[PDB]
Amino acid sequence: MSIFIGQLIGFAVIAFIIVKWVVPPVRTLMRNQQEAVRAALAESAEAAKK
Amino acid sequence: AEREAMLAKTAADNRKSAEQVAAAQADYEKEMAEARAQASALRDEARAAGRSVVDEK
Numbered sequence: 836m837s838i839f840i841g842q843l844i845g846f847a848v849i850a851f852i853i854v855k856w857v858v859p860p861v862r863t864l865m866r867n868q869q870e871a872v873r874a875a876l877a878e879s880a881e882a883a884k885k
Numbered sequence: 886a887e888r889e890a891m892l893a894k895t896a897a898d899n900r901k902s903a904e905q906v907a908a909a910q911a912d913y914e915k916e917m918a919e920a921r922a923q924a925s926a927l928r929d930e931a932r933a934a935g936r937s938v939v940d941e942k
Contacts, residue, residue, distance in 0.1 A: 872888075879895035885902045
């Protein structure tokens with residue numbers, strides 16, 4: 836059990852680290868990527884309107 | 886690739902829409918020029934015919 840508890844606490848620490856410092860950037864980079872996809876997807880549509 | 890062709894048509898589309906505005910005007914001014922050339926030549930021919938009938942009488 837002691838080994839399990841120790842490795843679980845380590846996993847929790849690394850999970851917190853990634854969620855507080857690695858998740859935010861990946862999240863927002865993806866956010867911007869998708870937002871730009873959106874913008875361009877649209878463009879096409881509107882230029883077809885023009 | 887879909888994204889690719891989207892990007893494609895998109896751009897080509899904006900440029901060719903500007904080109905089509907230009908083409909519509911150009912077509913207007915060419916057709917107007919042709920029609921007004923026809924009108925001016927018709928008036929000139931009418932004046933020539935008037936000068937001929939004046940000469941006849």
